[PDB]
Symmetry: D2
Subunit: 484 residues, 4 copies
């Protein structure tokens, strides 16, 4: 199998290639083409031309119909998409079916429905001099959107940017993670099979720094960059687009807290924190790596979570009993295991986990790590402040509400938080104080796609979802007409 670029309506091979390797057993899955700067420029030019060749002038109804054809096209190959996603990431099959591919599909239908119903603002102005004017706000595409998408939830986070960009009449040059090329290449096959006009959607494969990703961010003819991934890489991109003052939309790192009050539903909160710590082997920007538990239930809470974490089954996705997969790569695992080392240096009590398992077969050539729980670290320790992006949480006691609010907000990140309580007043008054883009109460990672999603502080720039997506992927123009 060879994974090719998709440029101006046709698949294209290129220069050097690199192998796509399984995080489960290290086996070679495919070769992947690597786009050089000339090839990236090729794609950007194809997208600019497709703008002028008529895509810019499609109606919202025409665009929504295209989005629904694409969504139909994914469904028709649903199992192919699942198998591709599982092979790239090692994600358990059941989770790939219901969280990854399904939500990938829902992204297209959601923005299709939103651009069909979307309207605009109208204002009447009565000027001091007695004149009268009308104002209305129109939208046109930015033009060409460059999309650099992350490896942790590959199809989901890719379609999350591609669907609204196309919905607002932009063309797209998209570069998926070098670790997870497969489902994006299948999406290109769908684009091709439904006959999207050539150059409207372009896929380029390759690496990031000094490679295709960078080239894309520095191209003078892109109109904006959308990015999900590490905060440091967000900063690099922000500098790269600066001279062209390009638009940017960032979803970056987090060091999210879960707070469990003594009045919580105890067994739901333990199950909830298990999910928010170890889903996708803790490789979700929304995962909870800090937990604060009110002191009277702190010891029992640690004990109960330890039991449930040790009952997880770490392994290959073809095993129906598997409930946590590997990390994305042995390189990422080296970074996570180095934090696990640092926790011991910082004096942590290792409640469970703290290393990689041993299988005694080809799974040892993969990238597995055990679910890990720490206690005993102060709020100042590097391991409770710095994002690890592995399956780990630290748990600490707290004594009162004003204290734990401050401890939650003590972070240079501000992506998400979850709070567990049964009390009406407490639930609302605590949630409104948390300096994050999202706060869940007695829940986690429930995503209504109409709501504003993004981060504060180091965790992001802008919001997506609903009208925030409509406004980001568009240029707003206020048309002000004198009528008297």
């Amino acid at each position: 199998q060879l994974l090719r670029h998709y440029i101006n309506g046709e698949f294209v091979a290129s220069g050097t290639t690199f192998p796509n390797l399984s995080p489960v057993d290290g086996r070679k899955l495919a070769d992947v083409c690597e786009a050089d700067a000339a090839l990236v420029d090729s794609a950007v030019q194809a997208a600019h031309a497709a703008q002028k060749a008529g895509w810019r002038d499609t109606t919202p109804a025409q665009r929504a119909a295209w989005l629904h054809k694409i969504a139909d096209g994914i469904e028709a190959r649903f199992d192919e998409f699942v198998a591709a996603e599982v092979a790239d990431t090692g994600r358990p099959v059941a989770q790939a079916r219901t969280l990854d591919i399904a939500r990938g599909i829902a992204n297209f239908r959601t923005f299709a429905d939103l651009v069909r119903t979307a309207s605009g603002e109208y204002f009447e102005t009565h000027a001091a001099d007695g004149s009268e004017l009308i104002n209305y706000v129109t939208r046109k595409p930015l033009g060409v959107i460059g999309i650099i998408s992350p490896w942790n939830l590959p199809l989901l986070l890719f379609t999350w940017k591609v669907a609204p960009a196309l919905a607002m009449g932009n063309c797209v040059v998209a570069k998926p993670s070098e670790e997870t090329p497969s489902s994006a290449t299948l999406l290109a096959e769908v684009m091709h099979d439904v006959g999207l006009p050539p150059g409207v959607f372009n896929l380029i494969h390759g690496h990031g720094q000094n490679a295709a990703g960078e080239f894309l961010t520095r191209h003078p003819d892109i109109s904006a960059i959308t990015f999900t991934g590490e905060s440091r890489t967000g900063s690099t991109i922000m500098k790269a687009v600066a001279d062209g003052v390009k638009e940017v939309s960032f979803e970056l790192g987090g060091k999210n807290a879960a707070v469990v009050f003594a009045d919580a539903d105890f067994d739901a909160a333990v199950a909830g924190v298990l999910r928010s710590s170890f889903t996708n082997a803790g490789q979700v920007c929304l995962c909870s790596e800090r937990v604060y538990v009110e002191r009277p239930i702190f010891e029992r809470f640690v004990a109960a979570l330890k039991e449930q974490a040790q009952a997880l089954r770490v392994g290959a996705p073809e095993d129906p009993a598997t409930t946590m997969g590997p990390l994305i790569s042995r390189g990422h695992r080296d970074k996570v295991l180095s934090y696990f080392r640092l926790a011991v240096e910082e004096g942590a009590t290792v409640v469970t986990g703290g290393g990689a398992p041993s299988f005694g077969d080809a799974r040892d050539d993969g990238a597995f790590v055990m679910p890990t729980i720490w206690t005993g670290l102060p709020d100042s320790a590097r391991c409770v402040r710095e994002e690890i992006f592995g399956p780990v949480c630290h748990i600490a006691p707290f004594d009162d509400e004003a204290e734990v609010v401050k401890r939650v907000n003590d972070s240079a990140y501000g992506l998400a938080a979850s709070i567990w309580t049964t009390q009406l007043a407490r639930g609302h008054r605590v949630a409104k104080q948390i300096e994050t883009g999202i706060v869940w109460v007695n829940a986690w990672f429930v995503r209504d796609l109409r709501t504003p999603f993004g981060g504060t502080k180091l965790s992001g720039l802008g919001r997506e979802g609903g009208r925030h997506s409509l406004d980001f992927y568009s240029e707003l123009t206020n048309v002000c007409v004198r009528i008297a």
Copy 2:
């Protein structure tokens, strides 16, 4: 000596070096201005951060709206002083400073006070796959500390355009006005002080930009956002400076704006309108029309009529009631403009009127005056019709058809604003919708409803301000998602 001090944590404070504030009318020294170094800038940011936690963060919208109206009242109570400070710094004719600068400065505070008082939020119900139900609602809290760097061209107006929504949304502010125009911002600090706004909520720092107080502010790791109005090159520098902290940014940057006059336009209104859009504030507004396109059958008549009105302008000092155009901001800026005037001539321009400085024979010659200027004869590719000059000048070219002039207007790396003159219903709307700018006026110019989205496309900006766009920019949105079943 008049000494213009910083305002930090509820008091005026000098610093260890100063620079002169000079009149653009006769070059005389008006004051000495303190210069904030990087340690003083950091002090202002920390005061702003402490003021957030000391309770400004927890004010209600009603409380904020009341503060903003008190501030508005305090400026009104000193209206003539504000006028005189603005006139002294900019040379702007008095009658215009009164009605466009200071009056709209006051209106910014009242407008955002009323918007925040009525603003509401969104609520969504979620029925999840597993049968559970959740409610979502979207809350806004302040970003925190907003850094505000404002330009010299409409000093009080554009300073308050940012300060008012920032304070309305419960942020604290560290604001650095232009080194050319410190005076009205300093009076604003006195008003803040006199109404007793809590210490640290509003901080004023004076100084220069590059390698000075402005730059220091943008690289500070504890600011939450930078709002900036000014040159596009400076926007790019700021964007890099905040990158490591991923700070929010809102930019209103350069433009090379066009006015389009169709043969079916109201001729007398379009000539007066283009006089206005070209020479208001001596052409020193980001929104000014430095390119004009006129449909060929009325082109010669249009050029001739505009020439006559432009030569009826009276260039001089603001104390003369007859003055209708003032100086440029500084002799340095005048040097840049007169260098473009020479470049237009090398590129083959016909000088219809103006093209140089007046000659007075007294101290007004020590100021920064230049004459209203009109060019013709340059191709769309010429530097003088592509590069922002930010002086009292327009180039006029003929066009033959509608599809053509739309292309010529959009052939620009800028995309701030445009104005179209026509009496035809279909034409007005269909042309306006194709223009790649943040704003398009039809039979008007620089009409600003503060509820509408204002900003630029391409090199001319990032984001929108006005109405809900200001409400959202100066706040962090939080979606609160609560399981109920």
Copy 3:
């Protein structure tokens, strides 16, 4: 063929029947069942039960999916629906395809998309005493909607009320016009074939006063009545629901003006006024029966419209050359011909038309009338004030703008108006002065289904379209929760 009621998931025959007769040649098309009060009560009870049996608790996603199944179901029988509509009304086939059945279908998809994207309002309250509350606005169904629909655009105006009522989770008891039963009965067959839960949609056939329509309006267990038809009948219904204070939504009569300024595009304005006067043989509440033309083009305008009106071909829909059909019935024709008589009594100049044609075959057993133009009547004449609802317009000269605005607004009706001008300022400043629910400039009967549609004065109560439909077919509840 026998047209049956549809009650609680099954077709039901009833008591007496009446014939469905063609307006083209008088031939019998079918017998129609007639619902007595016990049968109407039967339907209302079935709808109330279906509310409690679970329809009230469907989600917006479930409802939208049902609406789309219904829309698919209509498309699958598109030609059957066209033939039924044409047979009932005599409408030309081409017009039945593109205006009637297509828009019937679009109504379902539109409200399906709107209830999927719809959201709600949230307000925070900071009370004087220092307390803090949140408010959010929820929607639940009214319950059971009684729908009485008109004969002029039968499927279109029926689905215009049925689609939003079902979208907001109501059950429906619907009574179509005794003149046009057929396409509504087919819609019931679609409801049945997709398996909508029993009692959610109920169809009752019969007449109005002292018959099924009245019975429905007086039932104590309906929650609201929606009605399109004559203003007098609106008043009767408003009185009938009064003791139960039921909700009402009315789209009633109009005496609409078209205004043509001398600066208009002359040939577009003549074509436009032909359309707005004689579409559906002038049997649309939106039709223009008054025209004001600026004096310098008044004589040429009358002459040009006369020529185009005489070029219309009045006849049976199976003739491909036919461009205007009959009136709905010989009874309605008697009322229209009595106004044509009154115009002569009032001193009108009859420019063209003024009577029924003669065919010399079975078409004389139908209900045809010729396109009719008058001049010479003062603003006070009954024939330019009272709604005729036939293919007629009166044309008058005017001299200035302020005059014609006043003459347009001089009416006890206020449904719609159209204005023809090429001038920017004039177009906007005149439109904003017109006391109607809708004003078109250089257009007529262009319906964006997201916009508010309804009348002022005698022409209506409420608006439908978009959020106005969402709010009408729902009960709003403000939930106010103290949190501190």
Copy 4:
């Protein structure tokens, strides 16, 4: 003689018959009130219609907002007079008249002034089948003349709740206050006059309801709408009366509202809250809780605590600073309430406290006082727990589970409001969402954010007012659809 006159077309005018205004505290005559016959009502409507065309129709939102703030200022300038008029008409304790009646009366004007100033509209683009393009925008103009019939229970508050949005949207008004409570509306007319509102924009007519001025107003063919707050039976009569003209209607009608107290509630807060929701204004608010349901484990303790607080109320005249509950509005209304008190006893109620009138031994006995009353022991089917009494009474019943009490609350032909007392997060939201009323409070009662939709379901109303709902009701929406290509 004090004579209370109509206010029509900019002047006070008497009419040919009068009726006495009597105190509900001691029955003394306070004034004579003019009675408007059908010819005078028609005069007021024609004056209102002429004022529309004389230019009130063409005011801007800024102009209207300014009028509304002037009116608010004029009431404030006479605050103590308004208080004394309201107290004299209703017997309401002075401290409550000051903070709930007159203060909120003023706030209605300021609130709608700010809403209209910021309100905007919708814009839609249409791409039609034939390739043409159109723009749509939605404009609002006044309905025209609004007829306002207001109740006696919170006279100034509920009168201004309608007058302010009507005037804000550029309508003229013909308003008829209750024959029981004419005084504060007459002072409002004096304020209208003193600020110089144009003649015919605001008209006040006094008189009775059925076969009198109120009825005449509703049947007038030249009014555009009727807004009405009061009994459901009267709403039905009005609905028939406007039918021939298809007038707009907005109704806020009766209720038989419940308060629900779960065992997990904050006990002391819920007892105080139910005291409030039951006996505020002597139980004469449409929103009062006349049914209470308490979860069985705390039922007996709840009844006992409420009894003790109810017996600590002090029933008497408003000049006594110790008074905490006033009289009913009239001896006729008291007759209706005391007849329900007798009916409750026949239906088998246990009288926990109250059940009759106090006995003073002086002229207060000539007024309309009755004691706070609590019942238990009646089934859900009893007339005394189904029919609105509009006096200071509540019935309390036990319940055992959540699904049960939701059904009991919703078992009503009314559906105005409800309040729920619980400390549980999930319960608060899931119960509130099932209640079939226009409003549901959780741990609160009668908290009115004027931006939210306010109204009733079933027999309790038609339409919503508040925020955009008032903006839309008091305006005709016009969609303007313009072809541009």
